[PDB]
Structures are given as C-alpha cells and as structure tokens.
Amino acid sequence: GIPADNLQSRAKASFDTRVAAAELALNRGVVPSFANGEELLYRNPDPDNTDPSFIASFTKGLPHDDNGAIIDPDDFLAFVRAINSGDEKEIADLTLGPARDPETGLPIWRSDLANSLELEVRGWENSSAGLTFDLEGPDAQSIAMPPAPVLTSPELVAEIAELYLMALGREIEFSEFDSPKNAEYIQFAIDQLNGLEWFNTPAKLGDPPAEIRRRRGEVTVGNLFRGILPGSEVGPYLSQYIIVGSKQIGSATVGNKTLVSPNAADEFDGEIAYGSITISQRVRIATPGRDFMTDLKVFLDVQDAADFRGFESYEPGARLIRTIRDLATWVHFDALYEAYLNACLILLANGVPFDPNLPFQQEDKLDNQDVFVNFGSAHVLSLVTEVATRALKAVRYQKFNIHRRLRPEATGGLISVNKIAAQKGESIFPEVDLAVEELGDILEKAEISNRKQNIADGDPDPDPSFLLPMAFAEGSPFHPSYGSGHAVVAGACVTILKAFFDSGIEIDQVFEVDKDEDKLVKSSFKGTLTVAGELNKLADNIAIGRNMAGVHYFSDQFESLLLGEQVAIGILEEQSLTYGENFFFNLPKFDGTTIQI
Amino acid sequence: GIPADNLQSRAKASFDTRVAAAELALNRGVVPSFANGEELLYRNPDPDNTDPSFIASFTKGLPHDDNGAIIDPDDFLAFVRAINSGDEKEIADLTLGPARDPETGLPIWRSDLANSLELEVRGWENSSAGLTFDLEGPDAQSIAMPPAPVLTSPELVAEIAELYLMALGREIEFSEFDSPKNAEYIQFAIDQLNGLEWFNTPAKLGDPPAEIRRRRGEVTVGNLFRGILPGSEVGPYLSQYIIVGSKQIGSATVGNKTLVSPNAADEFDGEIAYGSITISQRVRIATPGRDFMTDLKVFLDVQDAADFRGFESYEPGARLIRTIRDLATWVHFDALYEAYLNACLILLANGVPFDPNLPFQQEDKLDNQDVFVNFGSAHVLSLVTEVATRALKAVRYQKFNIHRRLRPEATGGLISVNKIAAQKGESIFPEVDLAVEELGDILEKAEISNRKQNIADGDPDPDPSFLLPMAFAEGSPFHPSYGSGHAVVAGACVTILKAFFDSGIEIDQVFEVDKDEDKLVKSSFKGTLTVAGELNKLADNIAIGRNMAGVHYFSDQFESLLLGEQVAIGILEEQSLTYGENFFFNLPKFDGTTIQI
Amino acid sequence: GIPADNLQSRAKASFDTRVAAAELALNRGVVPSFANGEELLYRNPDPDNTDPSFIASFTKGLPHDDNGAIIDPDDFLAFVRAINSGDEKEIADLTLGPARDPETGLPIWRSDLANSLELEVRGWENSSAGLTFDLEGPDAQSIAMPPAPVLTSPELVAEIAELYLMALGREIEFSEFDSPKNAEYIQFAIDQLNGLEWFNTPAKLGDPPAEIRRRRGEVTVGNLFRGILPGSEVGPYLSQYIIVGSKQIGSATVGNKTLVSPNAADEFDGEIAYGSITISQRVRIATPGRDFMTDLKVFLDVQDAADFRGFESYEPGARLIRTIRDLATWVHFDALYEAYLNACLILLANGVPFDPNLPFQQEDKLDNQDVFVNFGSAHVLSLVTEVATRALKAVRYQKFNIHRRLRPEATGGLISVNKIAAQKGESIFPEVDLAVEELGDILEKAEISNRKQNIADGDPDPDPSFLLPMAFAEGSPFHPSYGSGHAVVAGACVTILKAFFDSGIEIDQVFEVDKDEDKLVKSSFKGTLTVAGELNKLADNIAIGRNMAGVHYFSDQFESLLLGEQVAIGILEEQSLTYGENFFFNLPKFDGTTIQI
Amino acid sequence: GIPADNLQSRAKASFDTRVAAAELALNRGVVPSFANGEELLYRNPDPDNTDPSFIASFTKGLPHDDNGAIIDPDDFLAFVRAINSGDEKEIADLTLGPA
Amino acid sequence: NTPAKLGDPPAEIRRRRGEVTVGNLFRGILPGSEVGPYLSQYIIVGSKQI
Numbered sequence A, B, C: 001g002i003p004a005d006n007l008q009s010r011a012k013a014s015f016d017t018r019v020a021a022a023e024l025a026l027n028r029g030v031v032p033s034f035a036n037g038e039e040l041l042y043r044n045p046d047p048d049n050t051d052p053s054f055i056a057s058f059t060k061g062l063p064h065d066d067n068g069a070i071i072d073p074d075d076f077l078a079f080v081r082a083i084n085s086g087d088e089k090e091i092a093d094l095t096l097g098p099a100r101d102p103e104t105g106l107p108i109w110r111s112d113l114a115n116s117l118e119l120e121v122r123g124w125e126n127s128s129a130g131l132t133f134d135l136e137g138p139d140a141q142s143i144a145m146p147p148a149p150v151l152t153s154p155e156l157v158a159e160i161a162e163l164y165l166m167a168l169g170r171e172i173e174f175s176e177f178d179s180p181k182n183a184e185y186i187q188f189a190i191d192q193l194n195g196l197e198w199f200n201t202p203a204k205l206g207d208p209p210a211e212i213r214r215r216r217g218e219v220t221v222g223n224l225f226r227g228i229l230p231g232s233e234v235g236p237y238l239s240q241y242i243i244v245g246s247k248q249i250g251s252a253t254v255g256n257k258t259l260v261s262p263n264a265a266d267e268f269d270g271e272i273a274y275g276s277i278t279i280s281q282r283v284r285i286a287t288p289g290r291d292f293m294t295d296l297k298v299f300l301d302v303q304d305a306a307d308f309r310g311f312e313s314y315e316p317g318a319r320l321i322r323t324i325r326d327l328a329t330w331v332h333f334d335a336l337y338e339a340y341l342n343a344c345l346i347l348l349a350n351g352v353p354f355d356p357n358l359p360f361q362q363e364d365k366l367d368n369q370d371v372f373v374n375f376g377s378a379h380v381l382s383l384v385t386e387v388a389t390r391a392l393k394a395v396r397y398q399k400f401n402i403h404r405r406l407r408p409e410a411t412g413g414l415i416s417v418n419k420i421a422a423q424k425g426e427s428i429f430p431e432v433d434l435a436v437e438e439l440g441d442i443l444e445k446a447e448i449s450n451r452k453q454n455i456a457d458g459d460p461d462p463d464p465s466f467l468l469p470m471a472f473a474e475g476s477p478f479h480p481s482y483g484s485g486h487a488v489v490a491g492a493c494v495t496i497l498k499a500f501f502d503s504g505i506e507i508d509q510v511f512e513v514d515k516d517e518d519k520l521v522k523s524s525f526k527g528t529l530t531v532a533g534e535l536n537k538l539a540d541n542i543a544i545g546r547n548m549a550g551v552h553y554f555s556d557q558f559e560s561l562l563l564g565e566q567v568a569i570g571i572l573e574e575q576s577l578t579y580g581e582n583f584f585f586n587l588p589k590f591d592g593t594t595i596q597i
Numbered sequence D: 001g002i003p004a005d006n007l008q009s010r011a012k013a014s015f016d017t018r019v020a021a022a023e024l025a026l027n028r029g030v031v032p033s034f035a036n037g038e039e040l041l042y043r044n045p046d047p048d049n050t051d052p053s054f055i056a057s058f059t060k061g062l063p064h065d066d067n068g069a070i071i072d073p074d075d076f077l078a079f080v081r082a083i084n085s086g087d088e089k090e091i092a093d094l095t096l097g098p099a
Numbered sequence E: 001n002t003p004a005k006l007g008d009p010p011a012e013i014r015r016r017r018g019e020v021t022v023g024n025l026f027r028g029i030l031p032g033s034e035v036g037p038y039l040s041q042y043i044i045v046g047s048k049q050i
Ligand code: VO4
Pocket: A476, A477, A483, A484, A485, A486, A487, A546, A551, A552
C-alpha cells in the first residue's frame, strides 16, 4: 500500500498544533542564570556584626540608614522570599518605607521637601511577574542573562563614569556633539572615559564571552553615548524613526498617475500618518538644567519609597528631540512598545515592502493575492505589540528572581557617602573605592552641579554631594536594574520588525534636527542607511535614553536587548506551526548573522 | 529545522482515519430524550386499583380487555424491560396474544373472522434495534426526538381529526382536490380542522420550540393533507419523482448531434429508465372503499396480535397514483428507500448535474476527469441507500426505548369506546373526552362509514362503531408510533440527494395525473419548481402516505424527518475524512439554511 | 472478589466499538499486489529509441500514433504519477486527446465520423479512487488481485479468441445455443477454443495457484461462454433472477386461507413486484448486427478520447434477454448493484427465508419477534447496496495503481495492425505474433464481419480490418481492464445475499426465454437449482455480459469476483461487533467452502 | 498519609500549562456555521442555461458581464476551491480581472 | 415598522430594530450607543497631559 497521512477533525488539528508548539518550546531545553556573587559577598562593616550588608543589591523601598545601607537584613531576605513565592498576602506583609507617625499614620521622611508634600510610599512593580507562564514563546525562566558587572570591576567603573557624564551633559544638543562651542565638555567626556581601563585595554583570553562581546574600545565623538547594535554607529545619533514623519494620505501612485498629498510637507515636520489622523514626533520639554535627588536626604527618602512621581516641571509646547534630556523625557513615559509601533507605522505609510520570503508579496497579476490579516499590515501590527509582555516576564525573572542589581542612583549614593567620609579620613563602602578614585575629575564637576541644584531647591548652604543627578524626580522605577523593561521590549520589537519587513531596504533621505530651529534638516551623512540599521539604532536610542536619565547602566541595556531578541525569535518559531503557506521570515540578528524562521 | 509532517504505512493511515471519524462522532456529545409523561400519568379507573393503565402507550400484542386496555400491567413492564435489554430469551418469555385453546394451541380470538381464519400471532419488529451500534454516523442513542403530543392536547385533537378526515377521503383523487364535485367533503374537512384550536390559534411565547416549529395555521385546499417541508407547498400535491418517467436509452447528445430514443414517449407515461430495463410508476389498486378494523372485535384481535397481513383485495392492473388510498397502498409495501432511489434514477437518466462543489464536475477538456465511483452515479447510488439502516436504528430507539407512543388506531379505539359509553351515560377513557367532544361531526360521519363497512363484512346489524378506519387489514406495524420508519428514512435519503446533486436546478416541465385517464398531463402550475423542493415534497408524500393509511400522526412524521436529516449529515461529516480531494457537499437543510460538508 | 466486567456510557461504548472494528481490520494485515511485468518489458521498436512502448498498458486518452502506440512515453508516466497522487490540479495538467484546431479549439480527429460530430474528449473516471479510505471494510489497498495474463501467454490467446467468438456470435439466442440452425457457428466456436493450449492442456505442477484455479478445460456447448462460479454450470445459461418476475401483491397466506393476486400472471412475464409498483425484466433492443470501432481511424479516435457515448441505435420496445447482444446491452447502463437489488426483491417477494442462523427467524408464537431493521428486509436492502462503493475503491486500486492492463479493444488493435503488416512482410507488435497465428480462422471471419460493418458505415471500399468489434460505440469505459467494476460489485453483492438469505433454499420452477416468442417457458432442465447457485450464475451473467460487449477478459472477471467477495466478508466481520444478539451469517464462498460470520 | 500534590521542573510546568489551555479550548466543543442558501438558489435567467448565477455571492475580481453577473460560473467555483485549500499555486491559477 | 414574530430566528430577534428617530438614526445597538452624543468621547477628546 502507498504510504500516506490521514486527516482529523479541525478541532483536534488545532489542539495538536498547540501541543506541537508546546513540545517545540519544551524541547529547546533550559539554561540556568548565574548571579555575580555580590549579594552574600559584602558584609556589615561593624566588627560585632557578621550579617550581609546587601549594598550592591536592589533594596529600594526597604528602610535605609543615613549611609544608604538597609537597617535590617531580614527586610531584604523576606523581600527575596516574597519574590520567589508571589503570594499576595506575603507581599502585603513586607516592610515598605520608614517609620510612620502614630498620629497621622504618614511616613516620617528625612527631607523637608518630602514631609512638606506629605508623601506616601510606592510599592514594587510586579516583583513576581517572573513566575508568570505564557501561552506562547519561551518560558520566562528558560533563558538567562549573564552575571552583572561587580562594583569593584573596571566595567562598572566605566559604566558609572559614563552615566555621570551623561547627567552633566543633559543640556547638550545631539546635533551639536561636534560643535566647537561644546568642545571643552565633549573632549572632557571623551578623555575621561579613554582614561579608564575598560575602554583603553582590550579583553583578555579567558575573560567571559559575554564581556568580550559587550566590551567597548576607544571613545570618540562619533561613538560617544551610543549603543553597539549594528547600525547604531553609522550616520546621525537619532534613528530616522524617532524624528521623521511619514508619507501622508493623498500621496499615492494610481496606475500611471502620481497624486500628491496637500499635507505632504507634514512628512518633513515629524507628523506620522496614523491611519487618517496623526502622531507628532515632538516631545514635551522638561525644564532644562533641573535634576533630582542631588540632596542626600531627598535621595534617602526616595530609597525609602517616597513617591515623587509627577513632580517634574516642563516648558510650554513640544519640540523634535533636541537635547540628551529630551531623550530622557521621551523614555520617561513612553508605552514600552511605542517607538517600534511608531516606526512600524512610518514603514507602512512609506510603502516599505514586507519580507520578500513571505507569501503573496508579488504584484497581484502574478499571485492573485494581497496581504492584510496574514503576512500584511494587521499581522505585523499585532505581532510587534504582543511580544512586549512575553519579553517583560523574562526580564522580570532576571531583575527580581536572579540578579537584584542595585540601580545607578544607588551606586552614586555609595560613591557620594564614600567620598564624603574619605575626606574626613574614614572608610565607608570601600567596595566603591576604585570608582571614587578613578572618577575624581568627574565627581568634582558633579559636586559643583549638585550644589547649584541644592541651592536652587532652597537649601542656602547645602552639604557637599556627589550623587548621580537624576532626570526623574522619583529616580528609577520600583524594580532592580538588570535587565531593563525598555531594552528587553526594544530587543523583542525590533526583532519582529526586521523579521517581518524587507529589512535590507535602503532609506533614500537622511535627516537630523536643525541646530538653530525646531525643524528637520538634511543630514550631511554621505553613506547609505538601511531599515535594519535604523531599527537597531532606534532600539539603542530608547535603551540609552534610560541611561541618560540615570536609571540603567550600559550592560543592563545590551544584555536586555539580547534577551528580548530570544523571546521574539521563539514566538516566531512556535507560530510557524500554525500556517499552511510555504514561507519564512528572514531575520538579521544583533550578532550580524541571519536566521530563517 | 523546517516544521514537517511524516508518512506512515497505508494500513496505519486507514486505521487512524477510522479512529478520527469515531473521535469526531464522540466529540459531538449526546443529548437526552424526554417522553411526554403519559406512561405513568394515567391510572386504572377502578377505585381499588392504583396501577398505571398504560392506555396512551403502545401495547399492541399484549392482551387487552373488552375496552382495549391491557389486562395485566406486568405484561407491559416486562415488555419495557425486554426492550432495554434486547436479550432474545427474555423477549421469547414475554406474553404475546390472547389465551390459547388447550386442544389446538391456537389463539382464541374475539371475532368470527379471525377465528374462521385460524390466525396466529405476529411479534414485535426489532424491539431492541435501538441498542445496535453502527460503524458510521451518529450513534442511535446520541440524538433525540422531543416529547410526543399528549391525548389531552389541542395538537393531538387536531392530529386525530385530520387522520379521520383522510380515512373518509381515501377515494378522493389528488388532481380533483379543488374540483366542485368534491367541494362538500373538501370544505367539510377544511372547516372542521379550522374549527380546532391547534389550527386557529397561534403558538404562544414560552411554548416548546418544537411545537412552535411544527404548529400549523389556517387550513386551505392548497395545504390540505400536505406536509410543511420547504417546497411541499408549491405546485401540485405529488412530487414529480413519484409520477414521471425519465429520459430513455437512445436519447443522447453526441457532439453536435441529437439522437432520439424510439421509446422516448415512455418518459411521459411513468417509465423510469432503470439501467437498460424499466421501473413503472404505476401502483397496484387496492379495492376502493374497503377499509379495515371498523368492527371492535376485529380491532381488538388486531390489538392482541392477530396476523391479518396479506388480507387486502385488489382490482386487476395498476395506475399512476390517483387517489389518497393509492398513496396509502404505495407506502404499504415500498422498500423504505424506494422512493428516493427512484428519484435518484430519474435525476441520473435526465442528466441533472451533481453538486458543482464536488471535484471533476467540469467538462473533461478542462479537468481531465469524469466521475463514477467517487462524486458520480455509483457513489450516490450507494450513499442514498446505506443511510436507511442507520436512520432506522435511531428511530427504533425513539419508538421503543423512549416514547412508546400509541398508534392512531389505538387512539381511535379509545375515542370509540369512550363515545359508545357516553351515549349510555357512562364515562370510559375520560382522557380522550376533548377529542370526542371536538370531533363530534367527524365521528358522526365515521359511524356511518363504519356501519357500511361492517354490513359489507357480513354483519347484518352491526353495533355502532367510531373506530378510525384502517387502509391496511393489519393496521400499523408491530412497533410504536413515534417516530416513523418511513419518515426517518425519507429524511435521511432526501438529505443525501440534496447534498449530492445541484439541488438548485430548476425543473423544466411540471406534470400531474390526468383527471379522466390513467395518464400524465401538463400541470397548470405557473411558477418554478426546483430539485430540492421536489425532493422535500417526495419525503412529505411518503410520510403523509402513512398518515393517510391511518398509521402515523403529523408530529410522528415531521419529527422523524428532522431525525433522519441529522443521521445523514453525520454520515457525510465522518465520511469527509476519507477523501484526498478538495470539495464539499452543499446541503439545503429542512430549516431553510445551508451547511457545507 | 468475583471477576467482573464494567459498564461505561453509551457514547464511549459506541466509540470503543468503532475502534475495535478498526483494530480488527488493521490486525488482518496487508498483502502486496504484483503486476505481470509487461509495463517496462516492451520497448520502442525503433533502433535509436530505448524507451518503453507501454503497448500492453491501458493508455486510452493519451495521444496514439497510426499504429495505436502512444506517441510520448512521458504522457503515460505523468498519468501514472497523477494516479498515485490524486491531486486534482496535477490531473488537470495531463495530456488528454489529440492536437486541437487553433481556430475552433476542437480536437482534430482521424475519422470523418468523429470530425463530422465535432466530438470532444472524455476523461478518466476516478483515476485515484484507489487512494480513498473507507469507514468500513478492508482498506482498498490491503488486498490484491494477482498478475494479469501477458500478451504472449496461452491464457491471453484463449481469452482474446473467446472475445472475438462472442462478438461474432452476438445475434445468437441463448435458448438456441444447441439448435441445429446454429450448429455451424457454435461448433466452430467450440472447435476453435478446443484447438488452443489453454483449454486443451492442463496446468502444470509449479504454475501459479491463481492460474490453476481459473484455468478452463474442454469447451462444450454446455459451458460455452459461461463463467466458473459454482452453480453457473447447472441448468440454463441465464440466472432465474434476470428473467423471472416475482409473486405479486394480493397473493398471500392469511391463517388457513390462500389469496391469489389478480395480477398473478405478471410473475411469469418478467414483472418484479417492487413495493407496490413494478420492475420490468425486459431490456431495450440494440440494433441487431450493428457493431462499433471496426474502422482503424474511428478506433484510434476512441483510443484518443473521442466521446462516442450515446451513439447507439435501438429498435422500439423491449424484450426478455434473448441474444448475446441483449446481455451486452443490459450491462451497458445498469447501476452496478442493479442485478442483485433486483434478485433481492424477487427473493423477498417470493418469501425466500433469511439465514436460519439469524435471530428471530422462527414463527412469532415461539420467539415473540419479527424482523425488519435488523436481520430483515430493510437490513439486507441497505447492506447489499452499501458494499458496492467499498468494492469499487479496491478494484480502482488494482485497475489504476497496480496493473494498468490494456482493454480487449486495445489487444484487438495490436492484432489487427500486426496482421496487416505481416501480409506486407513487415513485423509490427511481434508481442501478439502468437495470438495472430493461433486465431487465424477467427480473424478471417472478423475481417469479413468488419468489411460489412465498414461498408454499412458509409465507407464504399474499406481497408482490411481485424479489430475486435465492440458492442458499444465508445468501447470500454475510461479506465484499465483489470479488474472490473461490474464483476467486483457482483462478487460483493452476491456474497451479501448468500450470507443474508438461506442460500440452500431450492427453487421450485425453472424458466427460460421461449425460442419463438417474447415470453418465459418452462425449462427442460431436470435437476434442482438453489438460491446460492442462481445468485452465483447472476454474478457470472453480469460479468460475462461485459466480455460479450468486448470490454473485459475472462481473468478480469473471475479475479474481480474473488476481490469483491473479500470486501463483503470484511464488512460483515467488522459489523458483527455492533450487535448484541447471538447469531451469524452462513456464507457459501465461491471456492465451495463455508464461513460463519 | 496526608493527600498531597507534587512539584515538577519549571519547564514541565510551563508545558503542562500550555497543554491545559489547549485542552480547555478543545473542551469548549465547536458549532457549525450555516449560510443563507442564496449561493445555489439563484440561477442563470437564460432559458437554455441551468447554471447558478452567483449574483448574491461576493465575486469581486472575477470577470463580470455588462449587467454585473459573472461570465463563467467555473471562475467562482475555482475561487471557492482555492479558498478551502489555501494552496498558493492554486490561488495563482485563478482568473482575476478582465481580458 | 413591524416587530419580529414568535418562531423567527433568535439572531434576527436580537438584532432587529424598531422605530427610527433622530436620536437613533444611523446608530448601532450596543448598550451605551443610544445615550448622549453620537460619537464616543474617545474619538474626539484629548487626555490629561504630562
Ligand atoms: O522600564 V526600565 O526596566 O528601562 O526601568
């Protein structure tokens, strides 16, 4: 008899498809996640106390002493227990915030500002979302981020130096990075970083492969404050997709005729055609020169859960992203998939082709088939957005269940307290001795910046402060540093977009924000940019925007991007079981190689 | 790796296909069947006897008293037990027939006629066929008919009135329903039925949905004695397929040439070309005006299993169906699939196209493929016949295991005994008081009809009798009333034919039986009939033929048609797993909607 | 504890029953089918062409050269590919018919007749039905027919000789086989066949068992043109069931009284009581002496798909089968199950008992149970018809997927072309040299017959032609020779009927068609015929009728009968799982042994 | 012993969760979809043509006559076949647009 | 201008509309569509700003 397959009911076929996808996911296997060892390494400095200090762990929300170290190790250990169980009652039992006034029930803050505002506490944002399963893609716990840099490492010294330089450079305009008027500061930044071992010495044989992949070399104006995804290094700092508008309704080719939108100019003034309405690329303008958490009392209140959310001031209006601070503002409030949805909408409006390896992408006279639900606009619009929550579950596992890395503000706190004590001949947080020594010149500038801010804030004679100035009043979100929500979602979303579109398409016109006016101008860039390159750049823009705000380190971002790529790939692989057509997505990965899914 | 399926051996693929079909059938779920409550409602009228009477249940074959009520309730309860077990020995233990003569062993009958014939008993026909499984289609027990009308209901009153009117109208010619010569009787029938609540009052919100679907309105000459399937109501009473012949061998189109059969006229004289031989549409002629079971003793003997089968007389010859009695004769002896096989053969000979959604139905120059074994004549010829036994198992379950509804003759027996007693001021079977009151005028006519028959049968001065005259000497088959074998098979078979053919095809010429001669004449009908419509009409013709014989009620037939439709649909659904081709059947269902299988 | 079984839900019991039946079918195992090796044996005779010629394979529809060999081997190889895949688009891509006129799109035929008719092509009838699964019975591919006779074999020589003799004997009346007026021709036929090795020499030890079973011996008037099923050899040529009518409505035994139908005579004039209507055994009369495809151009057009269906002429009226040609006509247009349904109806009307090993077959006073749905008339009427499609799937596999044997007309084509060429000293189709030499006398007669037909057809000076005259204008159906649709269905259907009835019942009166008038007469046969014997004879009648038309060989028929028997047996075996009763069918098989199922 | 549940690996728990969701969806059962009957109801108005007209069916893209009725019913029937198979080559074989 | 009747398809009964008014002209029948202005707030209003 002739070998054959058999049919079954549709319902059973659907069930079997779902089981086959689950089986595929299971058959990938799992890898462990390894932390860097700091959590139980660092011990209480008191000679009659053997307890861990937890100074390099995220402890935002647990009560801290005047040095910024948690008061009671049990507070953190219970937090860890609650992280791994996810039980809501157990979460509700944790210690959050400082001691409360028995008469009013309100937290008693250190700072006059916090007490005058009568601030309440804010809580951890989904501390157990790393336990949540998902109907599609790799399970949150099945993949790993590598150990975070330790406080004593050249990598961390380089990272924190860079964050201070970004903070002090917040009023610099992207289009003026190489302007003579900025040369003193820009060259200072370049020279400072080039003076650090991470940047001026290569990795050595036997170093962790993850370190080798992410380690940076000579700093230049051309790479200053940039990411390392392929494409980020070519042409202007900001991705085309975060400044340009799109082709507008009324511009179209109809047979042999070209119609021109009466609104065509809007493309070149940052208006994205969003269906039949518009998205403006112009960002709200946070008060220039105003930073936060530059006073130790306010800083400690924030570390103790003081809810400063909503405290920023703004100038009227909006403008195409101009300064480093503007990029920080952008990423303060974006929906996490916002940049990539917006890029997708520009690509669609501009008529950038889908992946030619999808079905039905030929002229309809040849294939008798146009695309929409599958392999078309509606498909990619759902797919780019749906991956975000799956990527976030995975990064939550890394953030809370694995690494619990302290946020940059916390590192800056240790540095400040250390430096102040050393000036009096005392050693506090020797763990950051190297950063304090290496960042001397930068910290001198930060001190001056902080005094100015402290005086502006109404303290006529402020204590010296070397804190990392925050772009946001509340500093970081209420979750650990490593990895990043923004960067994991960036990784997943741009992965989908490169997969779905013909990512090799070359962009015709390249723009930048004008040096003098709030408008786009032709870039002086002479090469060719591609969709793939500018999507990678967009991911790096959003990710580094968090660093420029003071809330993530370089390694948080890069490693998160890689994690999000894995999530999106796995979703595509499992979904491929569901289609009858013969096709694949061509995906250029972050590592420079291509996978067909 | 690229997702894939794998091959297996032919044998395993066949096995898996069969399992998948069984799985599909299992996954349909099952529904319960609900009886109307009469079985244990009606009690023995004797004040010292609390037993059920079972007067509204089928008890044909169990010994009855002089009123037609069973003598011993244990007889019926044992019958029920035997129905549910199917054990042959247990069946053989039941009580069947009246007491026997110890000298001859023969049953002792009430009637001189039965004793003179020395009749023996007949037994129940497959009382446990409702337990039989099947290799294809829905299991007999998986589907349901709704509760039957109760004796006290307006519906039952209407039903039994209609049956008496059919009995008294047996010598009326279909083609003369609206002839002035028949106006007195026809108007009597119309007026009587229009005087009944079922017909003259609509269903009300909250009535059972099944009642709402089958309830009839104003009776007219145009709908008198018709069914309600879509198509039955348009044009002449009898389906084309039970009177017309077909195209004959020798009539064909060969390229550009038309050849004409030397036997072409046979088409218009009721000859179906049956391969290279013929089927004659002409029915045998039962003696006009001769009815049966109009004497209470003969009636009770039949109730007590007296085997009167074969006792009818006939005139010589045969004729195209002319009278109501002729349709009764037709359905006395037909193979249950006979009408539909015959219709199928007419459709095939006349070249009516198969469903255009089947494969290979195009001219062969386009598809290189003609049809026969699959999607062609041999296919439909097996499929239309094979569904009959599967449908019959299902209706057996309803008949014997669920509802056990008394046959119309039994209802007429209660009515007659009641009315005779009431004339003497006594109350017997008050359960049918409403029917007796409502049917007064009809019963007056039946009394006169019965006296004439009783005299003809050799009783010079017969007792008054109000029994429902039977077309058949033995009355009903030896099984309960609800549902009907004929009607369930009708439902299943016409379902197959509408599915398999292009049922939307419009019929070119419409015929009727001539008013004066045994011949076809062109119908005066002005509209358009369709294949689907005339197949539905055929099903209603066969089903109502049983009612005209006196053996089923309207509700038995309609509900059975629906049950048979479900059986045929399920068979098609399970069979669809077996083909490699890309196709479906388009099936217009009885409810006016279409399913693609 | 006492060992026990348990109940489950009805629905699960139904499912398990179906799975158990599938398991039973799977556990039978499978056997391979072996072809005779001709397909790649015979090669193109051109010395510069090594390709197979495919001359012994069915290639009807593929374009042929002037000798009747296909023009392009790729045409046949693609046909084979399409056979095994069943893909409708692939089927639509095949080459069918000769080159077409670019102006009209019509095929360009060789013959004036075909061009004058403007014939189109006809396509293959379900070339992939051998891939179709079934819900019941053995899978189409699980069983086998043995290799067909090869062109060079004594068996094939005997087979083709017999077919020519039947063609030349088409006007001989069955009742006059032994009449002195027919003696010259009849003795010629007997002597010719007795001169052939197949008939005059026994099989030898080591010959294939299938050959030994089907090999025939001495030809006599008593076995001339008969089949070899047990029963075919006893009494008159034609089965009682293809000439007699049945008992008629109105003839019945009612208690101690015998009633006689006023239509009783119809039984003895070929009227089958078909419910309350009738089937006439009288067949349409194809023009005596008119054969087809006797001209090489017309023959080649038919081989190239010219659709001559419907081209025959007939005399007015109908008659009980009289001549060999009448049996050919019978089987031209019968529904494949028609003969056996008709026999079943005769058996039922005549009151022939069902198998006594079925339940409930006793008088009802003993068993309290009559039969209808199961073990009765409705049961057998569905079962005999349902087996036909299952048997046809199996024979399609053998026809198309396995053996692809050329039809007899094609063999006659090779013989004619060979003989014509040899007369000019050339060798064409040496493969049929033996047939040409052995059939010399027969071919001389065929030549004369063909010239007469060619002149009648309007060719005043026809080329010599030794083609096998066809009874049908289109010759064979559009599918290979081995096996036969008619014969496989015959095998399956008579198997069911012998199983279901008491096949040992002896028939009381034996009839034949009168020598002078169109009526039945008492046979002079002195022995006893049985139901089983006359059912076997009926199967052989239908099968050999195809051979008498010129469309099958002896071995096609016999082997098909055996295949159909296997299908029906397997259906009965699987269905036996579905009943609760204690019974079996007693089945006398074709090999003379009995199986109880 | 006290009745208990057991743990398994995270990976197996994820797999089992996904299967349980598929099982839930399967256990909902399915229902058929019924069309209104127009597709084969309406016939070609020409007295020598018994074909369906398909006038109440979506036929946008198939060639239409001057009245807006499709020219060739086979165009629509092939479209239906392609709809139910999804085969790209089969789709590419359909008739789209006028001559 | 005529209501559905007993025995009509349930789907018809659910979606069948009655008397047309300026207040329901060209509106849908989802609960809430019938109250207040034609257009949903969410297709004309802006939101609270940063
Ligand atoms: O949303 V973030 O993890 O980039 O703080």
